[PDB]
Amino acid sequence: VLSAADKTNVKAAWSKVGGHAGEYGAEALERMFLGFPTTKTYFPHFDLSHGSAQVKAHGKKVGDALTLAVGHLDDLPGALSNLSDLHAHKLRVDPVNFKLLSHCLLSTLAVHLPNDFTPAVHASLDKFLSSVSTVLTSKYR
């Protein structure tokens, strides 16, 4: 599914993210909640207001999980197993919402990394986020 070129594109792109993975995760969440309000249904216990500390905290965990995935491109099912259990079994997140967050993530990267967000990197990050979504929405136990 992911070619070797995609893996190296994702690897290099995420090296540009560097220590900002949490900030970008948080901003992506903020863009998703405002742009697709249905997604707020999955966080009824969150303070979703402007500057919310909960969103910032959750974004850090989303960013950290993606960094982990970037380091296990060759075995995402095994590396993300615990996260698949939470999202597919416990939380039963509609797969549609993963397309929305992926789009909001790419938007965030486009804002902060305009010179590095080339079409090819764009295309490889899209494949990457799609493969991560498939793992997190699947019951493969």
Binding site: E27, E30, R31, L34, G35, F36, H103, L106, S107, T108, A110, V111, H112, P114, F117, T118, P119, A120, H122, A123, D126
Partner: protein, 145 residues
């Protein structure tokens, strides 16, 4: 497909600064690179085999401008999207047989290009407003199915 008065004003103010040629060319080019199956409808444009050839293809830049100009007509007739895209809907549904899912894809790509061009000025609330616009365009373009 309705926005508030403040939303409309913000959407229109940003479109005043949109270069329809540069944004259109980049948006169509990214569609062909990121969703390669869309290339099938543009075989008469020539070599689309790699992003370099796609992003520098003059026919891609020209058509992208046309496409973005049509988004502009939608941005200026938010209350009449169906009638504004009626003819284009017949073209894409009854004559080209383009699956409506690709309309949504091109609208999200456009948003990503807008985010890349305007940076921090493309705020989350401003993006939220344009997500409504692109969805409205996408549904209007698929109304003939």
């Amino acid at each position: 497909v309705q926005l508030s008065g403040e939303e409309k004003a913000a959407v229109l103010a940003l479109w005043d600064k949109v270069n329809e040629e540069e944004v259109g060319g980049e948006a169509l080019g990214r569609l062909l690179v990121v969703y390669p199956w869309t290339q099938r409808f543009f075989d008469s444009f020539g070599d689309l085999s790699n992003p370099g050839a796609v992003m520098g293809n003059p026919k891609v830049k020209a058509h992208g401008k046309k496409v973005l100009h049509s988004f502009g007509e939608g941005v200026h007739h938010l209350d009449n999207l169906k009638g504004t895209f009626a003819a284009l809907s017949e073209l894409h549904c009854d004559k080209l047989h383009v699956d409506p899912e690709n309309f949504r894809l091109l609208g999200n790509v456009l948003v990503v290009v807008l985010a890349r061009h305007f940076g921090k000025d493309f705020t989350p609330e401003l993006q939220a407003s344009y997500q409504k616009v692109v969805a409205g365009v996408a549904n209007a373009l698929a109304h003939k199915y």
